[PDB]
């Protein structure tokens, strides 16, 4: 990701690899929690779908630019969600 040289597809691949990593961080952290912490089975997949629908608004922005922003949105939202799930887990632990 230091040799994209503005090649659009290479930028998307970089973003997409980060998205997949973050999805996997989130999904595995939820997985690793006892029936205790109260995560519904379908919590990840519902929040992930809602994030997708949010970022899919960028289908209404033209060209490479709209596609880049769509993927960047997916990433920033997942990053937000990862931090939130961590913080929640902490708030349950801190109780």
């Amino acid at each position: 990701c230091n040799d994209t040289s503005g090649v659009h597809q290479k930028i998307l691949v970089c973003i997409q690899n980060e998205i997949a990593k973050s999805e996997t961080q989130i999904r595995n952290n939820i997985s690793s929690k006892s029936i205790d912490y109260g995560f519904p089975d379908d919590f990840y997949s519902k929040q992930r779908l809602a994030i997708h629908e949010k970022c899919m608004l960028y289908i209404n922005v033209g060209g490479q630019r709209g596609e880049l922003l769509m993927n960047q949105c997916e990433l920033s939202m997942l990053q937000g969600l990862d931090i939130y799930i961590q913080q929640y887990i902490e708030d349950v632990d801190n109780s």
């Binding site: 090649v7 597809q9 060209g63 960047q72």
Partner: protein, 200 residues
């Protein structure tokens, strides 16, 4: 002589053959197809298939599945030359041809075949959309009667550079890449304009 879209070629198609497929990483990564890597995520490849001579080959088949990829690569094997050209024409029809029109609707005409300014239009339409206002906005309030191809190219590429942070507010880790590209295309379009070549 000069092939329309060659200046931005390396950012868009990057030497890829008509049969290249990438499977996007992630739950919603989808897949991207052909020379230009048209994605299934934003409906582009689906539109291409609807417009293609090979439309019916894909009957019943959804993009980002092995079946669809089998058929895509079969076609690229057995009709390499026609597939590549049909792909290129589709990018032309959905970005460049549309921007030429959109600009006409703002009172900006380009009824000639000089290569540099047409590469600019192609490039911009691909990067910002067939209906982008970028060129119009960069030329806003200049005298088109007495403006040179060189001036047009300078105004547009400086606009791109200088509005990068605003147009890509959401993606700051790419600003460096994007700004360089604007600078680099400017150089290449300026060289192309001096060689004074012809397209279409």
């Amino acid at each position: 002589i000069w092939p329309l879209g060659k200046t931005s070629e390396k950012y868009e198609s990057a030497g890829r053959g008509p049969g290249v497929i990438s499977t996007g990483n992630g739950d919603y990564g989808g897949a991207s197809y052909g020379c230009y890597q048209m994605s299934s995520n934003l409906g582009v490849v689906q539109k291409y298939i609807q417009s293609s001579k090979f439309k019916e080959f894909f009957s019943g088949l959804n993009p980002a599945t092995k079946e669809f990829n089998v058929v895509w690569q079969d076609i690229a094997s057995r009709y390499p030359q026609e597939f590549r050209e049909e792909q290129h024409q589709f990018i032309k029809r959905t970005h460049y041809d549309i921007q030429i029109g959109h600009l006409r609707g703002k009172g900006l005409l380009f009824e000639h075949n000089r290569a540099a300014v047409h590469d600019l239009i192609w490039s911009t339409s691909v990067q910002f959309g067939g209906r982008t206002n970028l060129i119009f906005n960069a030329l806003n309030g200049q005298n088109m009667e007495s403006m040179t191809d060189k001036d047009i190219i300078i105004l547009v590429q400086d606009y791109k550079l200088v509005n990068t942070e605003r147009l890509f507010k959401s993606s700051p880790s790419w600003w460096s890449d994007l700004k360089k590209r604007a600078v680099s295309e400017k150089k290449a379009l300026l060289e192309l304009e001096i060689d004074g070549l012809e397209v279409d």
